[PDB]
Design a protein around this ligand. Sequence first.
Ligand SMILES: CC(=O)Nc1ccccc1O
Length: 175
Amino acid sequence: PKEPEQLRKLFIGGLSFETTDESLRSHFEQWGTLTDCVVMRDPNTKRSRGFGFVTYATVEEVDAAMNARPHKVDGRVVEPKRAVSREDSQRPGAHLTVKKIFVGGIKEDTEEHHLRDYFEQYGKIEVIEIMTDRGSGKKRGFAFVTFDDHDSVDKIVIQKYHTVNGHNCEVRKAL
Ligand SMILES: CC(=O)Nc1ccccc1O
């Protein structure tokens, strides 16, 4: 069946105030079937709030849209982000826009190439830090991976599971 709708939505910030439901749809339909497309407006003035959202039919279409960034919509470069699927209890509905993940549960036998070979298919990697003990140099069993862009992290933390070097890993957004 269909992927959950929350995982098919893109919040689009930085809209031109002239962008409409129709012009936002004409732009983003280039990368897939849109089941929803709305510009947020003031309830009294109808003036744009400067953001909106689009819902694609599939997650692959969301990927296609994010891979086609930067998006210039009605003359303005906009800021698409996947919808918050797991929120911070203290900042409900806020996207924590970061480029770095914590990867835990990798034990002492996981090396840099294990992490790179796995995570490079989510995005362009800039830093891999396998954490070692300050006193002994022994591996501590966790790592940080820094990407060049936040959408890689968003794709990663949406997954229920990550298997790296045969280990079932815990992955979360970092700093
Ligand atoms: C807190 C936060 O930024 N959550 C989030 C955002 C995008 C995709 C998945 C997520 O869990």
